[PDB]
Amino acid sequence: LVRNIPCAVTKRNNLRKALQEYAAKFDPCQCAPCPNNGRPTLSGTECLCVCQSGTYGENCEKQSPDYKSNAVDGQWGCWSSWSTCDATYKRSRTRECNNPAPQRGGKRCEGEKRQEEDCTFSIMENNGQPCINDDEEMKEVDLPEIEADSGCPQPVPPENGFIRNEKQLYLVGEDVEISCLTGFETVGYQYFRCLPDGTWRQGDVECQRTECIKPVVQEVLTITPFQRLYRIGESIELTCPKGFVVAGPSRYTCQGNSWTPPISNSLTCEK
């Protein structure tokens, strides 16, 4: 029920922990068994017996003429302590169900004798619990800031460029450094100066092409991949070395403009 309050998740997990401990401390398992298979119950620090119908007196000590049954029902003993983590890092604990032992046809204990928990270990330094709520997730879809500081938004880099030091908002006079993707190299002034007006002072920089990346292909291969990057000038063989027949040209080479072949298509050989 700890569901719609400030810090609801924190207090909920605290109260789970709490209820564990509290059970452990005040479970009626630690009472002496009630007579006439009454149920012990532990209100605070006194055990009270709840009597079966046909048993009466303050602690069920005496029984009506019809309560001939002498069967002793096997109420649970207290859980043993958690065992040391096993070969699968599970701890387990067991309660014999001996308190009293079922006798003369008395019922066996209903709950499972044994419980198992994974050993799970807290390694971070503890500041104390944060206040955490069920509302505390939002995506990209969060609202923009007012940005009244008017510090510049992240600029659009040149094509084949990327922003080295991405930030959501740049203070006035921050350098944002453009850099070029693998095929490309910054020639010029790669830096934009965020002006107090929020204009960028677009730097005199362009990413020339120096390299060509190993091309995408329509096939599992139809290629020999000598390199990840092939210099401007070098060449490549799209090839189907056996059985399959070429359905496209073979030799291709890096011009700095672009790949001469089609990007969308390859030899489409039969493999």
């Binding site: 006035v172 006079g173 100066r193 002006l195 107090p196």
Partner: protein, 698 residues
């Protein structure tokens, strides 16, 4: 609840300041000690300061502790300490309250030898550096020049030995960006005060003559729209009129005081001859605009008349350009505001109201007629009205003063003030209205300061004489009332004022002291504990004090004339009330001519010292806690009050040919004479001395 206490403290502790904390206890008759301490928060573990104070009948159970949070004792590091515990302990009580602390001790004034520099000049700069007590801070200062790009350019730290920090000259970088450079000064270490100044780095020649454009007033309405007289005057900086010149006037319809398409009015571009240095002109908006543009009326132009003026000497090679950036075309020219008006009633005291009238592009309009009408609400909403009083604003102050005789039944007053502008309807003569609320005493146990609207500034060393009347059901029990005098954050004076046998009470007779000179705030309070319940009762008033310098440094040249002559050897005499440092700067008056209205560097420095006043408004308050809070105090009491409910928005109520030389700092041991040759410029040298001593800046 007979035994009660008030400990009164500045609303915020300044780090490194000495905070005078005053304790009053009521109903005790045995003497006892209390200790007042400042302890680290929340742990109370470190006692930053502690003061032991004896409360006894000759004290009259009133005493104070001088507590100081030394800056290096706070832990510092990544997090500043935002809070501290003020604690009191005695035989009879203990209480502790979380007090805010501020790392903001003292004042940095950046003095730049000129407002304007060409490139290749070095900007000589020095910082005057004052403690929260207005004493030489002796703190090293980090001084940061920001190019109008906003890029950090330079940082220089200089030891403060004197309260004057003569930084090295900052050579303008060999390719500056023109326009408004910024200088930021910060104390290097703990205190995080800031100073800021601006200088414009610009390609300029010193103008030869001060062309002055002096419109009759800064707005155009139905009166003026047909006819708007505007006066040109030009004087040389040696102050002799430009005996003849050709004046060129050009006009534009400027939509905003912004870089714009000015839509220049060739219909109105005009020539006149500067007869003996003056040329009266008038612009007719009708013929100008209708003849050139669609706009038939200022109903279409709630905008600005741009005007630019070229004066050419007509018999000489000099020419100077002057501008007004824009004169507001307006349907409704004026707005009211209150000045020094508490908006709090003192039932049975004449309620002074003061409205200033401001125009658009505000200046004090001086002579506008004003009428005030109000509704008076008595207890149980028993509503009534007052006849609409009229007053003309004071010509040299803009203030229409009013006084309303209020019956002692008034619970709230709400009053409206409107411009009886003869040339307008009310639909354009703007109008305003305000709520004024009574003190809301719970017991009806009121206290009033009978301050007779003495907004005229008080004179240092004169005796104050403020009548105070604790009108209360239990005046039988109110033996005495307490007063506190506040100046900046500090409780500078505190005391007690007996009930005479007649049940008159002593006036506040204390002399106004030199530590009060910017301003002061008087707060007056008593606890009366009638029946079994205490009420803290309090009032405060704003005290306007003369800006009398403590050292009163005065500077004059020994010879005197209409004019000295180029290169004339002259003696500068500096005479002072006390030993003082004095910093001298001569600049050519022309340099301000580079600009329109270039303010002298240390204009209104007392109006900057005033910003350490923690209170706001002219005094009064909604409630005892509100009275203390608006006075800039806070308190510990068991008398059924606390001001933790009193949080509010920030409060904005209003109440050789050198260009510069003589850039020198001297010890003037009460008198000193300089000798120097006046440079060859045929100009008025504005020579500014700034004194620094153990009594602050003059």
């Amino acid at each position: 609840q007979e035994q009660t206490y008030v400990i009164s403290a500045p609303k915020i502790f300044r780090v490194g300041a000495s905070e005078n904390i005053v304790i009053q206890v009521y109903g005790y008759t045995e003497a006892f000690d209390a200790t007042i301490s400042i302890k680290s928060y929340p742990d109370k573990k470190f006692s930053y300061s502690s003061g032991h104070v004896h409360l006894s009948s000759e004290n009259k159970f009133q005493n104070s502790a001088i507590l100081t949070i030394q800056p290096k004792q706070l832990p510092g590091g990544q997090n500043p300490v935002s809070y501290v515990y003020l604690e009191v302990v005695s035989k009879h009580f203990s209480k502790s309250k979380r007090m805010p602390i501020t790392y903001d001790n003292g004042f940095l004034f950046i003095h730049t030898d000129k407002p304007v520099y060409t490139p290749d000049q070095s900007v000589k700069v020095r910082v005057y550096s004052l403690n929260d007590d207005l004493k030489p801070a002796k703190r090293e200062t980090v001084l940061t020049f920001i190019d109008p790009e906003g890029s950090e350019v330079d940082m220089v730290e200089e030891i403060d030995h004197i309260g004057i920090i003569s930084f090295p000259d900052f050579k303008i970088p060999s390719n500056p960006r023109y326009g408004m450079w910024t200088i930021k000064a910060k104390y290097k270490e703990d205190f995080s005060t800031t100073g800021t100044a601006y200088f414009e780095v610009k390609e300029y020649v010193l103008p030869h003559f001060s062309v002055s454009i002096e419109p009759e007033y800064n707005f155009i309405g139905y009166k003026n729209f047909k006819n708007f007289e505007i006066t040109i005057k030009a004087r040389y900086f040696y102050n002799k009129v430009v005996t003849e010149a050709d004046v060129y006037i050009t006009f534009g319809i400027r939509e905003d005081l912004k870089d714009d398409q000015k839509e220049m009015m060739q219909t109105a571009m005009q020539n006149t001859m500067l007869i003996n240095g003056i040329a009266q002109v008038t612009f007719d908006s009708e013929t100008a605009v209708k003849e050139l543009s669609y706009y038939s009326l200022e109903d279409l132009n709630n905008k600005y008349l741009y005007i630019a003026v070229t004066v050419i000497e007509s018999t000489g090679g000099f020419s100077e350009e002057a501008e007004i950036p824009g004169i507001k075309y307006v349907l409704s020219p004026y707005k009211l505001n209150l000045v020094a008006t508490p908006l709090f009633l003192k039932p049975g005291i004449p309620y002074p109201i003061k409205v200033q009238v401001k125009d658009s592009l505000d200046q004090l309009v001086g002579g506008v007629p004003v009428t005030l009408n109000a509704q008076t609400i008595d207890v149980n909403q028993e509503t009534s009205d007052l006849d609409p009083s009229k007053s003309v604003t004071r010509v040299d102050d803009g203030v229409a003063s009013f006084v309303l005789n209020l019956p002692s039944g008034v619970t709230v007053l709400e009053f409206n003030v409107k411009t009886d502008a003869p040339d307008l309807p009310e639909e354009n003569q703007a109008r305003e209205g305000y709520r004024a609320i009574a003190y809301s005493s719970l017991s009806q146990s009121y206290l009033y300061i009978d301050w007779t609207d003495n907004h005229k500034a008080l004179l240092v060393g004169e005796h104050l004489n403020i009548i105070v009347t604790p009108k209360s059901p239990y005046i039988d029990k109110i033996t005495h009332y307490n007063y506190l005098i506040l100046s900046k954050g500090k409780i500078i004076h505190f005391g007690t004022r007996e009930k005479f046998s007649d049940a008159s009470y002593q006036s506040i007779n204390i002399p106004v002291t030199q530590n009060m000179v910017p301003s002061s705030r008087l707060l007056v309070y008593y606890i009366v504990t009638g029946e079994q319940t205490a009420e803290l009762v309090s009032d405060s008033v704003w005290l306007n004090i003369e800006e009398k310098c403590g050292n009163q440094l005065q500077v004059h040249l020994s010879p005197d004339a209409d004019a000295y002559s180029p290169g004339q050897t002259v003696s500068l005499n500096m005479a002072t009330g006390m030993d003082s440092w004095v910093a001298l700067a001569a600049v050519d008056s022309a340099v301000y001519g580079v600009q329109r209205g270039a303010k002298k560097p240390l204009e209104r420095v007392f109006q900057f010292l005033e910003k350490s006043d923690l209170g706001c408004g002219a005094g009064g308050g909604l409630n005892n806690a509100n009275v203390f809070h608006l006075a800039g105090l806070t308190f510990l009491t068991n008398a059924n009050a606390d001001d933790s409910q009193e949080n509010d928005e920030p409060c904005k109520e209003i109440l050789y040919f050198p260009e510069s030389w003589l850039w020198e700092v001297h010890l003037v041991p009460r008198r000193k004479q300089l000798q120097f040759a006046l440079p060859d410029s045929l100009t008025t040298w504005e020579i500014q001395g700034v004194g620094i001593s153990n009594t602050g800046i003059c």
